[PDB]
Write a protein that binds this ligand. Structure first.
Ligand code: HEM
Length: 153
């Protein structure tokens, strides 16, 4: 359970992300695909992309980054009271997209890295630890839904 002070750190940096949702979404998905190429393979939509320059030039990838970060921002702003938001996301990611919980750990690392690069003044160690806790809570709750459905592993 995050404290109020931890949530304030999380949402303070997140409010900075929302000034350029699309640029953050590109940076995060590109970092994910470069650092963990198995993740790119899960996207029929993107797996034709073979270089970082091609990834950066894809408008469709930029659009999907906005989709992803809009969903995550709506979860973070619930401060843990996010059951309604996680139900459809766990269902699609477990049963349709077939995304292991481990790949959610990978995108969480990519999110933290990009926030540290773009917002160092608002993403000191206290805020890094709080965002790590928020993304851990996300993964914990998604993992419980995966386990219900028979996909935790
Ligand atoms: C912060 C974590 C993530 C969030 C908030 C998120 C959010 C979303 C949303 C909102 C959609 C569209 C609606 C839906 O299908 O449920 C989507 C689609 C999808 N996501 Fe995620 N996602 C996350 C992580 C991942 C990861 C790590 C992968 C793969 C490694 C992944 C793979 C996919 C795929 C394959 C689609 C369908 C893309 C398409 O063909 O249109 N997601 N995601």
């Amino acid at each position: 359970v995050l404290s109020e002070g931890e949530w304030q750190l999380v949402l303070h940096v997140w409010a900075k992300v929302e000034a350029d949702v699309a640029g953050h979404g590109q940076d995060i998905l590109i970092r994910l695909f470069k650092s963990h190429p198995e993740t790119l393979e899960k996207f029929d939509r993107f797996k034709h992309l073979k270089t970082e320059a091609e990834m950066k030039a894809s408008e469709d990838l930029k659009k999907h980054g906005v989709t992803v970060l809009t969903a995550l921002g709506a979860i973070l702003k619930k401060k843990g009271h996010h059951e309604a938001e996680l139900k459809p996301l766990a269902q699609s990611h477990a049963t349709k997209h077939k995304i292991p919980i481990k790949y959610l750990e990978f995108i969480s690392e990519a999110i933290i890295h990009v926030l540290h690069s773009r917002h160092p003044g608002d993403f000191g160690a206290d805020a890094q630890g709080a965002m790590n806790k928020a993304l851990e809570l996300f993964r914990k709750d998604i993992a419980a839904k995966y386990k219900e459905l028979g996909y935790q592993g």
